[PDB]
mmCIF file of N, CA and C and ligand atoms in Angstrom:
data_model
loop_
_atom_site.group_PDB
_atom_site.id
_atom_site.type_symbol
_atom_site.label_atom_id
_atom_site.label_comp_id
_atom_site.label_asym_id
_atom_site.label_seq_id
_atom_site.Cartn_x
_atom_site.Cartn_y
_atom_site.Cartn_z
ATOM 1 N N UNK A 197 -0.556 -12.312 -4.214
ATOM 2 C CA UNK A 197 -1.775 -12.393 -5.016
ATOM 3 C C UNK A 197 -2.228 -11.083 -5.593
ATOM 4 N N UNK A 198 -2.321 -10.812 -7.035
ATOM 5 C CA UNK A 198 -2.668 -9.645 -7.662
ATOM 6 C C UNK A 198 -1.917 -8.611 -7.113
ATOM 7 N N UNK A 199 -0.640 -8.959 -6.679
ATOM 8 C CA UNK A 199 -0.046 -7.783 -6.677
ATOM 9 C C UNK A 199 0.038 -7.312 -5.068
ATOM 10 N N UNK A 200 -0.327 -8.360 -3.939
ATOM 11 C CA UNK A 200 -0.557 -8.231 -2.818
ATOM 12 C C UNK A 200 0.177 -8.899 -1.998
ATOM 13 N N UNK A 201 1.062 -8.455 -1.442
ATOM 14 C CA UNK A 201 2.343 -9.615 -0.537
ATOM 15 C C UNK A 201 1.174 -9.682 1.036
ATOM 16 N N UNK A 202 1.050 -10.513 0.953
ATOM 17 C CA UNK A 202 0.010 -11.122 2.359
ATOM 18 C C UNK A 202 0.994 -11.679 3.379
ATOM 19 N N UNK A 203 0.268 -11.901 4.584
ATOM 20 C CA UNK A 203 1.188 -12.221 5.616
ATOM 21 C C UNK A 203 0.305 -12.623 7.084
ATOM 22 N N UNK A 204 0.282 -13.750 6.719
ATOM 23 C CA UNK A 204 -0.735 -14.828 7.971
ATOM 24 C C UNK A 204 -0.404 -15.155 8.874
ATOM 25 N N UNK A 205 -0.402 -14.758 10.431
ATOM 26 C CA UNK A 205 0.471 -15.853 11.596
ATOM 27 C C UNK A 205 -0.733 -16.303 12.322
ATOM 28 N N UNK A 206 0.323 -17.016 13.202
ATOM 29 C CA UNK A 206 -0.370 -17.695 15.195
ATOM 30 C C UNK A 206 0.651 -17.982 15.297
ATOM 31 N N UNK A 207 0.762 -18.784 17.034
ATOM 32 C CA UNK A 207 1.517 -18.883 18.079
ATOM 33 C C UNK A 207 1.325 -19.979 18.735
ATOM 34 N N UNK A 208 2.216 -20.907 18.385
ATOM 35 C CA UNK A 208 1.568 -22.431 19.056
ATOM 36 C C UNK A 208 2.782 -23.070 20.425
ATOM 37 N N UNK A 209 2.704 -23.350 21.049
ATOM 38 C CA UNK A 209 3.768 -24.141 22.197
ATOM 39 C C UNK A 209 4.543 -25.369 20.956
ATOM 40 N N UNK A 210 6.187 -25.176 21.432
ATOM 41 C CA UNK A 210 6.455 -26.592 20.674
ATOM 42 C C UNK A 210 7.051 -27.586 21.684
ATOM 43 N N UNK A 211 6.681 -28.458 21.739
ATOM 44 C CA UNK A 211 7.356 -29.866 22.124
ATOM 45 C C UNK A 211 8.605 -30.142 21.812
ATOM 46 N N UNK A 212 9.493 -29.866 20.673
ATOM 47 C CA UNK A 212 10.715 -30.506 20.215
ATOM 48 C C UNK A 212 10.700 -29.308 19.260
ATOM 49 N N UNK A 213 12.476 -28.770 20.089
ATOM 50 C CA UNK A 213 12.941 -27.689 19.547
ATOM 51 C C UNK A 213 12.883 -27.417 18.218
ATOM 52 N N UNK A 214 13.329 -29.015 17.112
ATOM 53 C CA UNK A 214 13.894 -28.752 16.263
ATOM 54 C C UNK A 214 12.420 -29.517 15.320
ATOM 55 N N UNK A 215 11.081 -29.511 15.576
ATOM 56 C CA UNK A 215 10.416 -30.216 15.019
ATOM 57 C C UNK A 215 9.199 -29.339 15.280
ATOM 58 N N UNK A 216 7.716 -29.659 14.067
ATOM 59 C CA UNK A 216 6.617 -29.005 14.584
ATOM 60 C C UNK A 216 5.681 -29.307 15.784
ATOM 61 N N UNK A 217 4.606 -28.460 16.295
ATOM 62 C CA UNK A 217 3.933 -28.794 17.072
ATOM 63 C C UNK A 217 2.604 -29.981 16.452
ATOM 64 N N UNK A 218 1.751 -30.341 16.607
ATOM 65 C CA UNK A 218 0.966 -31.341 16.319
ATOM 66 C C UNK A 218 -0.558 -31.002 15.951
ATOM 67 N N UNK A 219 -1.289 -31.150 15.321
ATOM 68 C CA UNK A 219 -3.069 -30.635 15.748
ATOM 69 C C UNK A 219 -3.117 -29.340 14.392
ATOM 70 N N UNK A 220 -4.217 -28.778 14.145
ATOM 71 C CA UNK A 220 -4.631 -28.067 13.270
ATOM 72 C C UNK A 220 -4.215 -26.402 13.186
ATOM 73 N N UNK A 221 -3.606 -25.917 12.820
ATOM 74 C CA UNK A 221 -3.357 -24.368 13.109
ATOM 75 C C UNK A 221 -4.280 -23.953 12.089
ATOM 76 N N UNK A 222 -4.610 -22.677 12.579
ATOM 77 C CA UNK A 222 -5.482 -21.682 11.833
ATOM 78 C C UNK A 222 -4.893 -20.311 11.834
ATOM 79 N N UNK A 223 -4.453 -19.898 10.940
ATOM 80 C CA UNK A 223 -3.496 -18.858 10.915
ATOM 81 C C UNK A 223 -4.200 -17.469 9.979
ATOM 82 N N UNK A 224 -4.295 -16.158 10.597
ATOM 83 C CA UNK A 224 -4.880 -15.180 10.262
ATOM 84 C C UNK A 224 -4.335 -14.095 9.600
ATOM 85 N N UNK A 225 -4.267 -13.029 8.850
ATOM 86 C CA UNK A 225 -3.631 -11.957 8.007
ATOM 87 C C UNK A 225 -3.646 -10.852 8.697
ATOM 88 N N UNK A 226 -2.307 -10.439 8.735
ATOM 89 C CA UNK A 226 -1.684 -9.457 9.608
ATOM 90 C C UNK A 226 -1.537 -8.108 8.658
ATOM 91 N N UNK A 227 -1.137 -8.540 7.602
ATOM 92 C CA UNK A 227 -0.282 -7.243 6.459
ATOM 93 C C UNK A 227 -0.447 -7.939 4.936
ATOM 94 N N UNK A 228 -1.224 -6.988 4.234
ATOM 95 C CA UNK A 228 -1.271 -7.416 3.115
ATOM 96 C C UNK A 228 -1.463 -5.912 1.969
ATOM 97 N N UNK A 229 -0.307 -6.043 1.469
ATOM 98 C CA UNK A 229 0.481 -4.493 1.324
ATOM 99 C C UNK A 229 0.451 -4.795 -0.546
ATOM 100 N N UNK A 230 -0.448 -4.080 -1.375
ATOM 101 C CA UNK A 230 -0.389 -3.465 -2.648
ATOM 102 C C UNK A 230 0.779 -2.729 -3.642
ATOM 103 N N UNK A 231 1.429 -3.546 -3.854
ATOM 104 C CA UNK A 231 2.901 -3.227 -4.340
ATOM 105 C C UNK A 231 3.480 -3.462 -5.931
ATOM 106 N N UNK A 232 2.678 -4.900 -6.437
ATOM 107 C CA UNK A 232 2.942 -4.529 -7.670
ATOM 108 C C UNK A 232 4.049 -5.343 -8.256
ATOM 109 N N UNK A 233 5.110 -6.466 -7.311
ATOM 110 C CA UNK A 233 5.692 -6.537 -7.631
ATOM 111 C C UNK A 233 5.595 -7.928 -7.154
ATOM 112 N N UNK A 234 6.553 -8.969 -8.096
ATOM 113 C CA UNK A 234 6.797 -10.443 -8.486
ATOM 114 C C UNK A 234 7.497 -11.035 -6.842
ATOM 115 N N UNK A 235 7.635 -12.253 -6.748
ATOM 116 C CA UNK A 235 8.904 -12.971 -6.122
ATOM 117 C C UNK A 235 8.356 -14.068 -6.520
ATOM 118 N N UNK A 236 10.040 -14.258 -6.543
ATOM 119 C CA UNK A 236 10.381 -16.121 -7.187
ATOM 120 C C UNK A 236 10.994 -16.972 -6.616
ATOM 121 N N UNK A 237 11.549 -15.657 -5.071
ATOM 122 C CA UNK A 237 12.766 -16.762 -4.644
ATOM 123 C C UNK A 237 12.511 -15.756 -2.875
ATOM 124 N N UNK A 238 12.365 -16.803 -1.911
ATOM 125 C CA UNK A 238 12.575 -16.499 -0.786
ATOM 126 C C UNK A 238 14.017 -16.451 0.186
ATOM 127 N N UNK A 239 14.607 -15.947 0.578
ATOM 128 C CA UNK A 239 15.752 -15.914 1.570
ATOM 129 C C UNK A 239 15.230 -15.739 3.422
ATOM 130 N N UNK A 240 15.772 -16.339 4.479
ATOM 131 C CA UNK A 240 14.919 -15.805 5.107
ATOM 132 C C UNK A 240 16.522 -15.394 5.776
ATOM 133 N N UNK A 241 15.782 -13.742 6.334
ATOM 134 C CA UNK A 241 16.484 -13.371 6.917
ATOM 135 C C UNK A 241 17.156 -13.278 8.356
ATOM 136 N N UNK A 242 18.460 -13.452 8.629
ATOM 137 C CA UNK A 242 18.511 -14.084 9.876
ATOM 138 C C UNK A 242 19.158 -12.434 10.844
ATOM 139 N N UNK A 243 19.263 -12.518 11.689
ATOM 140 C CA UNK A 243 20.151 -11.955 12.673
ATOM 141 C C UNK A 243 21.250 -12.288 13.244
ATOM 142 N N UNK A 244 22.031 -11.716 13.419
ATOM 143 C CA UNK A 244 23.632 -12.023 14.044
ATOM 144 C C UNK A 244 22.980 -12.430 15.380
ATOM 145 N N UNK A 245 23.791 -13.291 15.849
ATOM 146 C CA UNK A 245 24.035 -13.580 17.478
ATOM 147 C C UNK A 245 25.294 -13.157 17.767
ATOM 148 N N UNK B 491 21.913 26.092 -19.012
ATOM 149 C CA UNK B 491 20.748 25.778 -19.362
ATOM 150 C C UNK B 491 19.602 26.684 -18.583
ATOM 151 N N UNK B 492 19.618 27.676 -17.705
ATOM 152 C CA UNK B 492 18.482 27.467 -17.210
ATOM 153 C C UNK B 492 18.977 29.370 -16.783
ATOM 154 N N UNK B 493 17.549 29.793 -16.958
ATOM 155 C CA UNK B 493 17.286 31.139 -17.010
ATOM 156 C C UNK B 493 16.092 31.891 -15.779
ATOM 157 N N UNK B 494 16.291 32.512 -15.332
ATOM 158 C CA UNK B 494 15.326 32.735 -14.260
ATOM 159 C C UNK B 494 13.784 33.449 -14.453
ATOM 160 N N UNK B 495 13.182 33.282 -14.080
ATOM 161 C CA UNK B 495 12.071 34.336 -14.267
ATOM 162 C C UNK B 495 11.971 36.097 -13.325
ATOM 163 N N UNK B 496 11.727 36.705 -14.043
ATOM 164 C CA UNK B 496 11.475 38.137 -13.789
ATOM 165 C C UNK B 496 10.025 38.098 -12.753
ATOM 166 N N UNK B 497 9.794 37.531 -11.742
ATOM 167 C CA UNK B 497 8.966 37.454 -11.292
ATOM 168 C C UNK B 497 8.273 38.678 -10.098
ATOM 169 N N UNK B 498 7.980 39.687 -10.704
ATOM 170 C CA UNK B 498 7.786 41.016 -9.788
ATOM 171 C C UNK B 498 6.462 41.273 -9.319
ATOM 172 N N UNK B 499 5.938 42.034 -8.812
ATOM 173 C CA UNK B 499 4.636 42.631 -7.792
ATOM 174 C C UNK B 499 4.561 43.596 -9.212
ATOM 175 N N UNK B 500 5.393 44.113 -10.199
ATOM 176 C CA UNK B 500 4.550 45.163 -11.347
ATOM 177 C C UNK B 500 4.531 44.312 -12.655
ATOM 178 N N UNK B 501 4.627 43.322 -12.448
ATOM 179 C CA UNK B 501 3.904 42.717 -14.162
ATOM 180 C C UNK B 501 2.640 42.575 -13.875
ATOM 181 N N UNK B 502 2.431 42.978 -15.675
ATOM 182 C CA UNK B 502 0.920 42.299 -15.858
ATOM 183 C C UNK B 502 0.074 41.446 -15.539
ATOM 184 N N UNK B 503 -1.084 40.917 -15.634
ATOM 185 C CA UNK B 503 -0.996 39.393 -15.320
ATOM 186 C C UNK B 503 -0.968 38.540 -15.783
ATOM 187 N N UNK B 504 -0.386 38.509 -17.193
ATOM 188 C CA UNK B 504 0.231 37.181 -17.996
ATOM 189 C C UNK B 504 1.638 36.956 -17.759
ATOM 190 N N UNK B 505 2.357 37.945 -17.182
ATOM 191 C CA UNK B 505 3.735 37.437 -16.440
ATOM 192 C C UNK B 505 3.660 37.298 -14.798
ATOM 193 N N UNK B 506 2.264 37.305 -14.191
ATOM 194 C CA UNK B 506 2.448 37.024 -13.254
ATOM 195 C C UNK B 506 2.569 35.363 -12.558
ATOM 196 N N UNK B 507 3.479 34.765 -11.728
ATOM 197 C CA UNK B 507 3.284 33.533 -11.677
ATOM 198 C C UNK B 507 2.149 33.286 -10.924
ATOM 199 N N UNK B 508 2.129 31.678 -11.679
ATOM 200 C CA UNK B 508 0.986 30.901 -11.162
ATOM 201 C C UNK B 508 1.376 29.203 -10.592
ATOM 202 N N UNK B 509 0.744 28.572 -9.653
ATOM 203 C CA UNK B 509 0.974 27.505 -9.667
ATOM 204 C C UNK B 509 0.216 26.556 -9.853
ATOM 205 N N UNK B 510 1.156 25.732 -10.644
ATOM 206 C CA UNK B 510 0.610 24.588 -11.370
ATOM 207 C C UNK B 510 0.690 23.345 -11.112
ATOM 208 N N UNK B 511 -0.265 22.217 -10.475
ATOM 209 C CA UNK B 511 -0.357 21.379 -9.676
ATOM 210 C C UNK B 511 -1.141 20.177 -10.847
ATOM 211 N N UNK B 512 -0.847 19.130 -11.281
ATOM 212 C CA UNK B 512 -1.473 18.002 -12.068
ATOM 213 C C UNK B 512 -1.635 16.738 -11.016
ATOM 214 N N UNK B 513 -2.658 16.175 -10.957
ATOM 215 C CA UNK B 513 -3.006 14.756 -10.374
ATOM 216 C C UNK B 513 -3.232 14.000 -11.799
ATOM 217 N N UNK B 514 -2.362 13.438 -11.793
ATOM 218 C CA UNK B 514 -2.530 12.328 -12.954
ATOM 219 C C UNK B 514 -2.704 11.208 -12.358
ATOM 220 N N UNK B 515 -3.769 10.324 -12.896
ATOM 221 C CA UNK B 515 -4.281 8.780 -12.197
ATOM 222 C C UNK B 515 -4.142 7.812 -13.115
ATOM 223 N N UNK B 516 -3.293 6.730 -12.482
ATOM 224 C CA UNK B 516 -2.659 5.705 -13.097
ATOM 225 C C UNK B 516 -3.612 4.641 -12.802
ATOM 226 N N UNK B 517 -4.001 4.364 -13.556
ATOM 227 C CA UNK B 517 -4.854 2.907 -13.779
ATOM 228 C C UNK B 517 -4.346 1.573 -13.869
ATOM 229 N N UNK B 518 -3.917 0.687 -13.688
ATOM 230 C CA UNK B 518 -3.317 -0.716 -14.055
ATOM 231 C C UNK B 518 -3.904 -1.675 -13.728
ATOM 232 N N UNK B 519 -3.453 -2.799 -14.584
ATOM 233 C CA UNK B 519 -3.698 -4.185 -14.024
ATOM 234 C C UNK B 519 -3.205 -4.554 -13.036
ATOM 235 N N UNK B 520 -3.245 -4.152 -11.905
ATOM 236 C CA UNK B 520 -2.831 -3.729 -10.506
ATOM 237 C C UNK B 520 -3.127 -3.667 -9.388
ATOM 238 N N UNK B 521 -3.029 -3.491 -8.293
ATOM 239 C CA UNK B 521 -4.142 -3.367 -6.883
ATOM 240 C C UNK B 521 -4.576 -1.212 -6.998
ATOM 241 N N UNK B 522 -5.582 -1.212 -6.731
ATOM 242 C CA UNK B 522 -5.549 0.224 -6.477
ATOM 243 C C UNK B 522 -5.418 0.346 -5.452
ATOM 244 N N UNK B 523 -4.719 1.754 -5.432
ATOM 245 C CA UNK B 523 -4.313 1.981 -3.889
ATOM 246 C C UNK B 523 -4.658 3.866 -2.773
ATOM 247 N N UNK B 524 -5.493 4.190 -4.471
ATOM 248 C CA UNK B 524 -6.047 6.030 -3.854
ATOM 249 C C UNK B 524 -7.468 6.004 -4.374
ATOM 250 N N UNK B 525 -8.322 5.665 -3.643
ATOM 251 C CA UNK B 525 -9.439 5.769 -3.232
ATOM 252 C C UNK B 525 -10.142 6.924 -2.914
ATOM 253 N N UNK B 526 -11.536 7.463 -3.691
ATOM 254 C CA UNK B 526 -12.243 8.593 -2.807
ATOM 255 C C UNK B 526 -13.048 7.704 -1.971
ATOM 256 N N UNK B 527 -12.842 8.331 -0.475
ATOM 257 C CA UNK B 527 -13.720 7.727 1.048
ATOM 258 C C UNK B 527 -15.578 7.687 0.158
ATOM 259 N N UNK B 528 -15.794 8.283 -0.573
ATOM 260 C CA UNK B 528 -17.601 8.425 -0.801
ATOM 261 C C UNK B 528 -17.858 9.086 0.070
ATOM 262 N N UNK B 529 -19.108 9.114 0.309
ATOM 263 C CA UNK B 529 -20.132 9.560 1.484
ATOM 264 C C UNK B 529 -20.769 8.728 1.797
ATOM 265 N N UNK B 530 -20.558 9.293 3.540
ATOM 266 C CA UNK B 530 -21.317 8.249 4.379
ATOM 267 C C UNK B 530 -22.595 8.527 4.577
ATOM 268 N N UNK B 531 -23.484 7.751 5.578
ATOM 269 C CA UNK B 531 -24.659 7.586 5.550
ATOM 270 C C UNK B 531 -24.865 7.095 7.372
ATOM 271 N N UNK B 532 -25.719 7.364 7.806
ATOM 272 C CA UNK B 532 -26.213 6.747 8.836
ATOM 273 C C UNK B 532 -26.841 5.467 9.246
ATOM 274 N N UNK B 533 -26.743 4.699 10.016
ATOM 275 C CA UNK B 533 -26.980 3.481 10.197
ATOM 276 C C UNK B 533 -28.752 2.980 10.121
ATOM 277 N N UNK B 534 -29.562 2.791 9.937
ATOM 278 C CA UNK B 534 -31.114 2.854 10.225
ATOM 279 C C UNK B 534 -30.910 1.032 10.373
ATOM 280 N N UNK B 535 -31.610 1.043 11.740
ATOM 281 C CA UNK B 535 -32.493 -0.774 11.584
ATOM 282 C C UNK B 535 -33.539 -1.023 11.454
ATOM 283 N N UNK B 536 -34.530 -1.978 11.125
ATOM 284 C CA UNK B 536 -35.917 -2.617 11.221
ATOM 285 C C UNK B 536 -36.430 -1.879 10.338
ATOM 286 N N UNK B 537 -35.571 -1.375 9.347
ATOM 287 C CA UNK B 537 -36.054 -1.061 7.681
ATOM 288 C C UNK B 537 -35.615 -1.479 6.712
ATOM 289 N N UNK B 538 -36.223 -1.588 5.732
ATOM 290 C CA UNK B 538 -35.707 -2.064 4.126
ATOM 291 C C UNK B 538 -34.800 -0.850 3.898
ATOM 292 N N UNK B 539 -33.214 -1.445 3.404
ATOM 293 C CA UNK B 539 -32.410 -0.748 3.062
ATOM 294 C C UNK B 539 -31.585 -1.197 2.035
HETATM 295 C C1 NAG C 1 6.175 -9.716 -12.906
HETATM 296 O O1 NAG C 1 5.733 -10.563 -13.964
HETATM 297 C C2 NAG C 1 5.113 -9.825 -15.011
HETATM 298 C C3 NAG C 1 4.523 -10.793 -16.029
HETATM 299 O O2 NAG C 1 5.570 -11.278 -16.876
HETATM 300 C C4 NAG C 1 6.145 -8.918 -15.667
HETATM 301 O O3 NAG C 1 5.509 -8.129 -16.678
HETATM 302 C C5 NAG C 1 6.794 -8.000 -14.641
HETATM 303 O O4 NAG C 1 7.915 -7.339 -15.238
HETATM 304 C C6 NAG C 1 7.265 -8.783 -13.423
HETATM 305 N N1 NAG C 1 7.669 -7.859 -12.382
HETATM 306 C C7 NAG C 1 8.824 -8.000 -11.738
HETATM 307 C C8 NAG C 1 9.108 -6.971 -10.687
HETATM 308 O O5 NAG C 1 9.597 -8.910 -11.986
#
């Protein structure tokens, strides 16, 4: 937003590994960094095992 | 290309060096991101402020 890459979490217990948890999350801003610059396309980045 | 300066303790002082430092401020349709802090002020309660 205006040039502001934002970045909101929380931490919820899950029930089913491969599925979400249930009920309302409210999620708060951690990092929101003045940069100036576009994205159009997300990748998420993984780690080797 | 490039020539040195004669920079001595006996020149005048129009050959003596000087340094030259510019803050140029970039304005944009943009987030700003260099701020002057202002001046602060002290806290007062149970007054019109
Ligand atoms: C973001 O979009 C604006 C509006 O078209 C464009 O001027 C600018 O070049 C873009 N920036 C990047 C990094 O793609």
């Amino acid at each position: 937003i205006d040039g502001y890459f934002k970045i909101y979490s929380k931490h919820t217990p899950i029930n089913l590994v491969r599925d979400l948890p249930q009920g309302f999350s409210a999620l708060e801003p951690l990092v929101d960094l003045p940069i100036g610059i576009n994205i159009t396309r997300f990748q998420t980045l993984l780690a080797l095992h | 290309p490039l020539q040195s300066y004669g920079f001595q303790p006996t020149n005048g002082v129009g050959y003596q060096p000087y340094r030259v430092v510019v803050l140029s401020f970039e304005l944009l349709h943009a987030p700003a991101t260099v701020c002057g802090p202002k001046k602060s002020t002290n806290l007062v309660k149970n007054k019109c402020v």
